[PDB]
Short mmCIF file of N, CA and C in Angstrom, two decimals:
data_model
loop_
_atom_site.label_atom_id
_atom_site.label_comp_id
_atom_site.label_asym_id
_atom_site.label_seq_id
_atom_site.Cartn_x
_atom_site.Cartn_y
_atom_site.Cartn_z
N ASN A 1 97.01 102.15 138.84
CA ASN A 1 98.46 101.78 138.83
C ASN A 1 99.29 102.78 138.02
N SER A 2 99.73 102.44 136.81
CA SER A 2 100.68 103.33 136.13
C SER A 2 100.88 103.25 134.61
N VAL A 3 101.65 104.21 134.08
CA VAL A 3 102.01 104.27 132.67
C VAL A 3 102.71 102.99 132.21
N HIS A 4 102.37 102.52 131.02
CA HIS A 4 103.06 101.38 130.43
C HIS A 4 104.45 101.89 130.04
N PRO A 5 105.49 101.13 130.36
CA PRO A 5 106.87 101.58 130.10
C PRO A 5 107.17 101.78 128.60
N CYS A 6 106.29 101.34 127.71
CA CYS A 6 106.51 101.51 126.29
C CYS A 6 105.77 102.74 125.80
N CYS A 7 104.75 103.15 126.56
CA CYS A 7 103.82 104.19 126.15
C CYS A 7 104.36 105.61 126.37
N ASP A 8 104.11 106.48 125.40
CA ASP A 8 104.35 107.89 125.58
C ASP A 8 103.02 108.61 125.83
N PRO A 9 102.75 108.98 127.08
CA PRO A 9 101.41 109.44 127.49
C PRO A 9 101.01 110.82 126.94
N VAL A 10 101.95 111.60 126.41
CA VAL A 10 101.61 112.85 125.74
C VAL A 10 101.16 112.63 124.31
N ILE A 11 101.63 111.57 123.66
CA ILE A 11 101.08 111.17 122.35
C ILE A 11 100.11 110.00 122.33
N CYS A 12 100.15 109.13 123.33
CA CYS A 12 99.41 107.87 123.27
C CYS A 12 99.89 107.00 122.10
N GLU A 13 101.20 107.10 121.88
CA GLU A 13 101.93 106.24 120.97
C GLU A 13 103.12 105.65 121.74
N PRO A 14 103.79 104.65 121.17
CA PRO A 14 104.98 104.07 121.81
C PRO A 14 106.10 105.10 121.86
N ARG A 15 106.98 105.04 122.86
CA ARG A 15 108.09 105.99 122.94
C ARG A 15 108.84 105.99 121.61
N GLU A 16 109.41 107.12 121.24
CA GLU A 16 110.13 107.21 119.97
C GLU A 16 111.28 106.21 119.89
N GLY A 17 111.34 105.50 118.77
CA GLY A 17 112.29 104.41 118.63
C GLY A 17 111.77 103.01 118.95
N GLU A 18 110.71 102.91 119.75
CA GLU A 18 110.12 101.61 120.04
C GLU A 18 109.07 101.27 118.98
N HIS A 19 108.59 100.03 118.95
CA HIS A 19 107.64 99.62 117.92
C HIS A 19 106.20 99.54 118.42
N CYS A 20 106.02 99.07 119.65
CA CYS A 20 104.71 98.57 120.09
C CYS A 20 104.58 98.64 121.60
N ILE A 21 103.40 98.28 122.08
CA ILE A 21 103.11 98.39 123.50
C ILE A 21 103.08 97.00 124.12
N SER A 22 102.13 96.19 123.65
CA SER A 22 102.04 94.83 124.13
C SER A 22 101.48 93.93 123.02
N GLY A 23 101.45 92.63 123.27
CA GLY A 23 100.95 91.66 122.30
C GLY A 23 101.83 90.40 122.30
N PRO A 24 101.29 89.29 121.84
CA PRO A 24 102.06 88.05 121.67
C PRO A 24 103.35 88.31 120.92
N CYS A 25 103.32 89.23 119.97
CA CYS A 25 104.46 89.45 119.09
C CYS A 25 105.18 90.73 119.37
N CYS A 26 104.97 91.25 120.57
CA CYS A 26 105.72 92.41 121.07
C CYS A 26 106.49 92.04 122.32
N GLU A 27 107.75 92.45 122.42
CA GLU A 27 108.57 92.17 123.60
C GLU A 27 109.53 93.32 123.87
N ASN A 28 109.48 93.87 125.09
CA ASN A 28 110.19 95.10 125.39
C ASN A 28 109.98 96.18 124.35
N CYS A 29 108.74 96.39 123.93
CA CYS A 29 108.41 97.50 123.05
C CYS A 29 108.84 97.30 121.61
N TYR A 30 109.43 96.15 121.29
CA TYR A 30 109.85 95.87 119.92
C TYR A 30 109.10 94.68 119.32
N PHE A 31 108.97 94.69 118.00
CA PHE A 31 108.34 93.57 117.28
C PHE A 31 109.26 92.36 117.31
N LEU A 32 108.74 91.18 117.64
CA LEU A 32 109.50 89.94 117.43
C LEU A 32 109.79 89.69 115.95
N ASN A 33 110.92 89.06 115.67
CA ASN A 33 111.30 88.69 114.32
C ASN A 33 110.16 87.91 113.66
N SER A 34 109.89 88.24 112.41
CA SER A 34 108.87 87.51 111.68
C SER A 34 109.33 86.09 111.43
N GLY A 35 108.39 85.16 111.51
CA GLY A 35 108.72 83.75 111.59
C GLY A 35 108.60 83.18 112.99
N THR A 36 108.67 84.03 114.01
CA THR A 36 108.58 83.55 115.39
C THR A 36 107.21 82.99 115.64
N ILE A 37 107.18 81.75 116.10
CA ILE A 37 105.92 81.07 116.38
C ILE A 37 105.26 81.68 117.59
N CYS A 38 104.00 82.09 117.46
CA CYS A 38 103.31 82.75 118.56
C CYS A 38 102.15 81.89 119.06
N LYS A 39 101.85 80.83 118.33
CA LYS A 39 100.91 79.83 118.80
C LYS A 39 101.00 78.55 117.98
N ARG A 40 101.18 77.40 118.64
CA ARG A 40 101.14 76.14 117.91
C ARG A 40 99.74 75.59 117.75
N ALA A 41 99.55 74.78 116.71
CA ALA A 41 98.25 74.19 116.41
C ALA A 41 98.12 72.78 116.96
N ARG A 42 96.88 72.40 117.30
CA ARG A 42 96.53 71.03 117.68
C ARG A 42 96.99 69.93 116.74
N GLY A 43 96.94 70.16 115.43
CA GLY A 43 98.06 69.63 114.67
C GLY A 43 97.78 69.34 113.22
N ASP A 44 98.22 70.28 112.40
CA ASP A 44 98.45 70.02 110.98
C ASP A 44 99.88 70.44 110.70
N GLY A 45 100.54 71.01 111.72
CA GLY A 45 101.63 71.94 111.50
C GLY A 45 101.28 73.29 110.86
N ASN A 46 100.02 73.71 110.94
CA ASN A 46 99.68 75.06 110.49
C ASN A 46 99.71 76.07 111.64
N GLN A 47 100.92 76.43 112.06
CA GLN A 47 101.08 77.25 113.25
C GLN A 47 100.95 78.73 112.95
N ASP A 48 100.67 79.51 113.98
CA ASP A 48 100.58 80.94 113.82
C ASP A 48 101.93 81.61 114.09
N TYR A 49 102.32 82.54 113.21
CA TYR A 49 103.65 83.13 113.22
C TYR A 49 103.51 84.63 113.37
N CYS A 50 104.52 85.26 113.96
CA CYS A 50 104.55 86.71 114.04
C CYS A 50 104.88 87.23 112.65
N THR A 51 104.53 88.48 112.37
CA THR A 51 104.69 89.08 111.05
C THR A 51 105.98 89.88 110.94
N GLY A 52 106.52 90.30 112.08
CA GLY A 52 107.60 91.27 112.09
C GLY A 52 107.13 92.72 111.99
N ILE A 53 105.85 92.96 111.71
CA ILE A 53 105.38 94.34 111.57
C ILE A 53 104.12 94.66 112.39
N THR A 54 103.58 93.67 113.10
CA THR A 54 102.47 93.88 114.02
C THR A 54 102.71 93.13 115.32
N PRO A 55 102.00 93.50 116.39
CA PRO A 55 102.24 92.93 117.72
C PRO A 55 101.27 91.79 118.01
N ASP A 56 100.29 91.58 117.14
CA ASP A 56 99.31 90.54 117.38
C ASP A 56 99.82 89.20 116.84
N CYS A 57 99.06 88.13 117.05
CA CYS A 57 99.40 86.83 116.51
C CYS A 57 98.43 86.38 115.43
N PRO A 58 98.71 86.69 114.17
CA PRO A 58 97.73 86.48 113.10
C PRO A 58 97.41 85.00 112.96
N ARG A 59 96.15 84.69 112.73
CA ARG A 59 95.76 83.37 112.25
C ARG A 59 96.39 83.01 110.89
N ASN A 60 97.06 81.87 110.83
CA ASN A 60 97.69 81.43 109.60
C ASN A 60 96.69 81.34 108.44
N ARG A 61 97.02 81.98 107.32
CA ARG A 61 96.04 82.19 106.24
C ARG A 61 95.68 80.90 105.48
N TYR A 62 96.54 79.89 105.56
CA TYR A 62 96.19 78.54 105.10
C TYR A 62 95.14 77.80 105.93
N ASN A 63 94.77 78.34 107.09
CA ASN A 63 93.64 77.81 107.85
C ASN A 63 92.29 78.11 107.18
N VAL A 64 91.53 77.04 106.93
CA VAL A 64 90.14 77.16 106.45
C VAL A 64 89.31 78.03 107.40
N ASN B 1 105.89 117.58 130.77
CA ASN B 1 104.51 118.07 131.08
C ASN B 1 103.59 116.92 131.52
N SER B 2 102.67 116.47 130.68
CA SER B 2 101.68 115.50 131.17
C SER B 2 100.89 114.61 130.20
N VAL B 3 100.13 113.67 130.77
CA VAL B 3 99.26 112.77 130.02
C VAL B 3 98.25 113.54 129.17
N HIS B 4 98.03 113.07 127.94
CA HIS B 4 96.99 113.65 127.09
C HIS B 4 95.67 113.23 127.70
N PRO B 5 94.73 114.16 127.83
CA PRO B 5 93.44 113.87 128.48
C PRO B 5 92.62 112.80 127.74
N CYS B 6 93.00 112.43 126.53
CA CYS B 6 92.27 111.41 125.80
C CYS B 6 92.94 110.06 125.97
N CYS B 7 94.22 110.10 126.34
CA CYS B 7 95.06 108.91 126.38
C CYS B 7 94.87 108.06 127.65
N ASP B 8 94.85 106.75 127.47
CA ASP B 8 94.92 105.84 128.59
C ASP B 8 96.33 105.27 128.70
N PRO B 9 97.13 105.75 129.65
CA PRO B 9 98.57 105.46 129.70
C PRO B 9 98.93 104.02 130.08
N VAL B 10 97.99 103.23 130.59
CA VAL B 10 98.23 101.81 130.82
C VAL B 10 98.04 100.99 129.56
N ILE B 11 97.20 101.44 128.63
CA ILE B 11 97.13 100.81 127.30
C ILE B 11 97.82 101.53 126.15
N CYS B 12 98.05 102.83 126.27
CA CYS B 12 98.51 103.63 125.13
C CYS B 12 97.48 103.60 123.99
N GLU B 13 96.22 103.58 124.42
CA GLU B 13 95.07 103.75 123.55
C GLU B 13 94.20 104.87 124.14
N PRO B 14 93.22 105.35 123.38
CA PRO B 14 92.30 106.37 123.89
C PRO B 14 91.45 105.81 125.03
N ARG B 15 91.04 106.63 125.99
CA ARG B 15 90.21 106.13 127.08
C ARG B 15 89.01 105.40 126.51
N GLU B 16 88.51 104.39 127.21
CA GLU B 16 87.38 103.62 126.71
C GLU B 16 86.15 104.49 126.47
N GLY B 17 85.55 104.31 125.29
CA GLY B 17 84.47 105.18 124.87
C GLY B 17 84.86 106.36 123.98
N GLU B 18 86.12 106.79 124.03
CA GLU B 18 86.56 107.86 123.15
C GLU B 18 87.06 107.28 121.82
N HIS B 19 87.30 108.12 120.82
CA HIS B 19 87.69 107.62 119.50
C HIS B 19 89.18 107.78 119.23
N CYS B 20 89.76 108.89 119.66
CA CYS B 20 91.04 109.35 119.12
C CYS B 20 91.76 110.25 120.11
N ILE B 21 92.96 110.66 119.74
CA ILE B 21 93.80 111.45 120.62
C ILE B 21 93.86 112.87 120.12
N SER B 22 94.41 113.04 118.93
CA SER B 22 94.47 114.36 118.33
C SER B 22 94.41 114.24 116.80
N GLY B 23 94.34 115.37 116.12
CA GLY B 23 94.27 115.40 114.66
C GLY B 23 93.29 116.47 114.19
N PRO B 24 93.43 116.93 112.96
CA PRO B 24 92.48 117.86 112.35
C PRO B 24 91.05 117.38 112.52
N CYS B 25 90.84 116.07 112.48
CA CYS B 25 89.50 115.52 112.49
C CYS B 25 89.15 114.84 113.78
N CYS B 26 89.88 115.20 114.83
CA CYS B 26 89.57 114.76 116.19
C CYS B 26 89.31 115.96 117.08
N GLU B 27 88.27 115.90 117.90
CA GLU B 27 87.94 117.00 118.81
C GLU B 27 87.34 116.46 120.11
N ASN B 28 87.95 116.82 121.24
CA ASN B 28 87.61 116.19 122.51
C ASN B 28 87.55 114.69 122.44
N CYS B 29 88.55 114.07 121.82
CA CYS B 29 88.67 112.62 121.82
C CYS B 29 87.69 111.91 120.91
N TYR B 30 86.86 112.66 120.19
CA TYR B 30 85.90 112.05 119.27
C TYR B 30 86.16 112.44 117.82
N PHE B 31 85.77 111.57 116.90
CA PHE B 31 85.90 111.84 115.47
C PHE B 31 84.89 112.91 115.06
N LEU B 32 85.31 113.92 114.32
CA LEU B 32 84.35 114.84 113.68
C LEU B 32 83.47 114.12 112.65
N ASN B 33 82.24 114.58 112.50
CA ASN B 33 81.31 114.05 111.53
C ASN B 33 81.97 114.04 110.14
N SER B 34 81.78 112.94 109.43
CA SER B 34 82.31 112.86 108.08
C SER B 34 81.58 113.84 107.19
N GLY B 35 82.33 114.45 106.26
CA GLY B 35 81.84 115.60 105.55
C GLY B 35 82.41 116.92 106.05
N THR B 36 82.87 116.95 107.30
CA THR B 36 83.42 118.18 107.86
C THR B 36 84.67 118.55 107.13
N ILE B 37 84.70 119.77 106.62
CA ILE B 37 85.84 120.28 105.88
C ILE B 37 87.01 120.50 106.82
N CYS B 38 88.16 119.92 106.50
CA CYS B 38 89.32 120.03 107.38
C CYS B 38 90.44 120.82 106.71
N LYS B 39 90.27 121.09 105.42
CA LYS B 39 91.16 122.01 104.72
C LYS B 39 90.56 122.46 103.39
N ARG B 40 90.48 123.76 103.16
CA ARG B 40 90.04 124.23 101.85
C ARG B 40 91.17 124.33 100.85
N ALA B 41 90.81 124.25 99.56
CA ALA B 41 91.78 124.30 98.48
C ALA B 41 91.90 125.69 97.89
N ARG B 42 93.10 126.01 97.38
CA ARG B 42 93.37 127.22 96.61
C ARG B 42 92.41 127.51 95.47
N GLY B 43 91.98 126.49 94.73
CA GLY B 43 90.59 126.57 94.32
C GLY B 43 90.23 125.81 93.08
N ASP B 44 89.65 124.64 93.31
CA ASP B 44 88.86 123.96 92.30
C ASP B 44 87.51 123.67 92.94
N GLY B 45 87.39 124.01 94.24
CA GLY B 45 86.46 123.33 95.12
C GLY B 45 86.73 121.85 95.43
N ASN B 46 87.97 121.39 95.26
CA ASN B 46 88.31 120.05 95.70
C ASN B 46 88.88 120.04 97.12
N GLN B 47 88.01 120.22 98.10
CA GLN B 47 88.45 120.39 99.47
C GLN B 47 88.67 119.07 100.17
N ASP B 48 89.45 119.11 101.25
CA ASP B 48 89.68 117.92 102.03
C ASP B 48 88.66 117.79 103.16
N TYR B 49 88.10 116.59 103.33
CA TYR B 49 86.99 116.35 104.24
C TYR B 49 87.40 115.31 105.25
N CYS B 50 86.81 115.36 106.44
CA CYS B 50 87.03 114.33 107.44
C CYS B 50 86.27 113.10 106.99
N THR B 51 86.67 111.92 107.47
CA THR B 51 86.10 110.65 107.04
C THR B 51 85.01 110.17 107.99
N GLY B 52 85.03 110.68 109.23
CA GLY B 52 84.19 110.12 110.27
C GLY B 52 84.80 108.90 110.96
N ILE B 53 85.89 108.34 110.43
CA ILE B 53 86.47 107.14 111.04
C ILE B 53 87.98 107.24 111.30
N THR B 54 88.60 108.36 110.92
CA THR B 54 90.00 108.63 111.23
C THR B 54 90.17 110.06 111.70
N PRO B 55 91.29 110.36 112.36
CA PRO B 55 91.51 111.69 112.96
C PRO B 55 92.33 112.58 112.04
N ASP B 56 92.85 112.03 110.95
CA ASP B 56 93.68 112.82 110.06
C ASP B 56 92.79 113.55 109.04
N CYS B 57 93.41 114.37 108.19
CA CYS B 57 92.69 115.06 107.13
C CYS B 57 93.09 114.55 105.75
N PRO B 58 92.39 113.55 105.23
CA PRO B 58 92.83 112.87 104.01
C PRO B 58 92.84 113.84 102.84
N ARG B 59 93.85 113.73 102.00
CA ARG B 59 93.81 114.35 100.68
C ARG B 59 92.66 113.84 99.80
N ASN B 60 91.85 114.76 99.29
CA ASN B 60 90.74 114.40 98.44
C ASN B 60 91.17 113.56 97.23
N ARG B 61 90.54 112.41 97.03
CA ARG B 61 91.04 111.42 96.07
C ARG B 61 90.87 111.84 94.61
N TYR B 62 89.97 112.78 94.34
CA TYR B 62 89.90 113.44 93.03
C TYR B 62 91.07 114.38 92.69
N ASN B 63 91.94 114.65 93.66
CA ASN B 63 93.18 115.37 93.37
C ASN B 63 94.19 114.51 92.60
N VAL B 64 94.63 115.03 91.45
CA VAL B 64 95.71 114.43 90.67
C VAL B 64 96.97 114.26 91.53
#
């Protein structure tokens, strides 16, 4: 198929000015605001939140 | 010009099986053996060495 629209194929980094390529916490090449819920929990209210600085969805650190 | 031969443009990561894209300590998409000198010093013998796990040339930590 083809180049990811966020990717710069001569560097294998995101195009200059963009943050990221893909991930729960990446949207149109930019990081979602930290605090954005990226996964809800079955229920303690210990939900997983975006960091604002990575594209993944970190496990909430209060989880055992 | 064109895609870096190490780059996978649908992921913006190195092709599967390769380590890296470019850097003093990257060669043909693979990490140089750790211990490989990547820069000599003007002279204490405190040279900079590749790590075996990154493509950059770290400053030797014994440097003030």
